[PDB]
Structures are given as C-alpha cells and as structure tokens.
A = this chain, B = another copy of it.
Amino acid sequence: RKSATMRAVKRMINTHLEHKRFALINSGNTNATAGTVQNLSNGIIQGDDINQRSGDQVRIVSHKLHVRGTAITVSQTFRFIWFRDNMNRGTTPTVLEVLNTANFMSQYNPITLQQKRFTILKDVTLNCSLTGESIKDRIINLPGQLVNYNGATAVAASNGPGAIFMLQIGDSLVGLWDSSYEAVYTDA
C-alpha cells in the first residue's frame, strides 16, 4: 500500500508537465581506432521551443539511441558505448576517461568506474562483414534521469552532471557509422 498511491501521484504529476522532445542525427562518420566521444543531450539549449529548455535542468523521461555501421574496404568492428557522465564540469569526456586503453577491445577505466564518474547505459559491438552482413544497426530505448547544464548554448562548456554521450571506437579507420538520438524530457 502507500507505495502504490505514491506512483499514482507520480503519474498525476506527469500529466501536468510538458513532455518536451529533442531529436538529433549524426550520419556518415568514419570508424575510429583511437575513438571519439559524441554529445547527445548537449544539443538541448536554453530557449522556448519544444526541443529547448528553461534553466539548467531537465529530466529525461526516456531516451532512445540508434547506431549503425557499414564495413568499407575491410570487414571490421564498430563499438558504441552509450553513457551518462555523472560529474561533468563542462567538457566532452576523452576516450581514456571511459576506456582503460584506447582500443576497441578495452575494458572500462578502473579509476573512473570505481568513483562512478560515469554510468554505462549500453555497450554495443557490431561486427560488419564484407563477406556476410556488411551493414548492422541497433536501437536501444531506456528511461532517463536528471540532466544538469553548465551554460545556455550547445558547446562543451555547457555539459554538466548527467550529460549523455556516446563513445564510438572500432578496429578500422575506413568503415562508416551513423547514429541518431531522441530524448523525451520534462522541464518544470
């Protein structure tokens, strides 16, 4: 009891809040053996439109990430690591903050996972084969959390605690990857 009225309260609170929505696409990037980190939630900037925000917090209700790779020239691997930076002070995290070494096979950095600097949301490896399935994709939908910002505009210095990112890393420089991303969020 009492815990089940509580989540009827939650439902009621939510019918009262606008569920804003922000969508992004990022097509035709080369695979990277040293890795890159891509912004996801950074693109929600201060303003009055449906895919903007008031102040420096939003709360993601759910968000969805779609990754895709295509082998070019050689069969190859594409890894995508969807993560939340719980402690971001206005940066795009480096590969070496997240992975122990800059290698597509690397396990996580032991120091930064120990202190929970990051939370891994999903870690996806696609092996695209020029003698097999040369194109692969994966869509992942998850509930979200609080996201704090450190500024108004879509620049690194605006990222803050709870920022959402995706790390891409693979074993070739020559294949191509696409991603897209949507967050549904309240902003009250």
Binding site for B on A (CB under 8 A): 2, 5-6, 8-10, 12-13, 16-25, 27, 46-57, 59, 64, 66, 68, 75-77, 86-89, 100-101, 103, 105-111, 113-117, 123, 125, 127, 129-137, 139, 148, 150, 152, 160-162, 178-182, 186-188
Contact = CB atoms under 8 A, between A and B. Distances in A.
**What are the 7 A-B residue pairs with the smallest beta carbon separation, nearest first?**
A87-B87, A21-B110, A115-B148, A107-B182, A46-B48, A23-B107, A23-B100
A122 to B, nearest CB: 12
Contact of A161 (B10, B12, B21, B117): B117
A106 B180 contact: yes
A127 B132 contact: no
A100 B136 CA distance: 22
A111 B48 CA distance: 14
A122 B56 CA distance: 26
Nearest to A179: B105
A125 B131 CA distance: 20
26 contacts: A2-B5, A5-B5, A9-B9, A18-B57, A19-B114, A21-B111, A22-B110, A25-B105, A48-B48, A48-B53, A48-B54, A49-B55, A50-B55, A51-B110, A55-B187, A68-B77, A68-B105, A86-B87, A105-B180, A111-B150, A125-B139, A127-B136, A130-B131, A131-B131, A131-B134, A132-B132
Contact of A133 (B27, B114, B132): B132
